[PDB]
Amino acid sequence: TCLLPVEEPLVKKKIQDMEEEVKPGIEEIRWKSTNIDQFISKSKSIVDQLFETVNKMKDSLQKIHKSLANFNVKIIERKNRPMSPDDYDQFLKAIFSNKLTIVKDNGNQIQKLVKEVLDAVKADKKQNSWKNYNDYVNVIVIEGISTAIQTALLHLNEQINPVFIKRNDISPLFDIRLELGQSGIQFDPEIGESSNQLTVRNTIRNWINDFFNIAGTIQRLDTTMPGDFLQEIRSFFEIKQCLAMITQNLEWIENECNQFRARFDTYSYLWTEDENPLLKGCRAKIPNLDLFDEKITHLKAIQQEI
């Protein structure tokens, strides 16, 4: 019950090799009452060899699956509290580089683990057992990276509603300024600029894409020429999908900010027209200057409203 958990026909061939053989002459050894311990020693030597194989297999299995938890714990502890407006964001870039450094350290570990399993399989037709092994190893690696970016994307998912248990703008978040440019509403961090990556500047979504690369760049087995970017692309959108709440919440705050922009446009202010044409229209009216003084009083009340 030790070779079936790994489900390896290689170690099944090994159990076929192993057997306690005890010869017909030994059926006539115990009736002597003298020193008769040779068959036990032989079968036991066999046993020992198998048990060192067992320990190697258990250690390889353990370390393989344990190296995965490090990715997830690192990415969690890292993306729990980013708090990265633009320059703390510039620095969180280097912090995520430390994340990728944990990833590359476990890649330096990828080398050592394929070596330890070189020892573990202990086969001559190594590659055939290499299939049965690295297949499963790679699928579990995919699962681990998936859960990693899961926790990250869900971290930043948990930032939308300021109404559920408390508010959400609890910490210093990215700051956005409101300007009157060329006689019109203008957000220097435009909703679209903090949104869709355009020529002037990139923001949250491109940050997500770059985090996606930082995560999915380990050296896979099976000739190692590619990377496992794509089992990620598959899995996230197979069940997990967190990018979806990302998109919909981003567009939600977008619509909220557009409504607020319309509200700003509602100041009842004119089209910022030249003062000369309105002056000339009132001139054509030929009113007393007191009407222009009431117009200026309205303008002063507009300044007071501002």
Partner: peptide
């Protein structure tokens, strides 16, 4: 390039 993470499937 294949050497790049490349990831940027806009």
């Amino acid at each position: 390039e294949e050497g790049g993470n490349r990831t940027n499937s806009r």
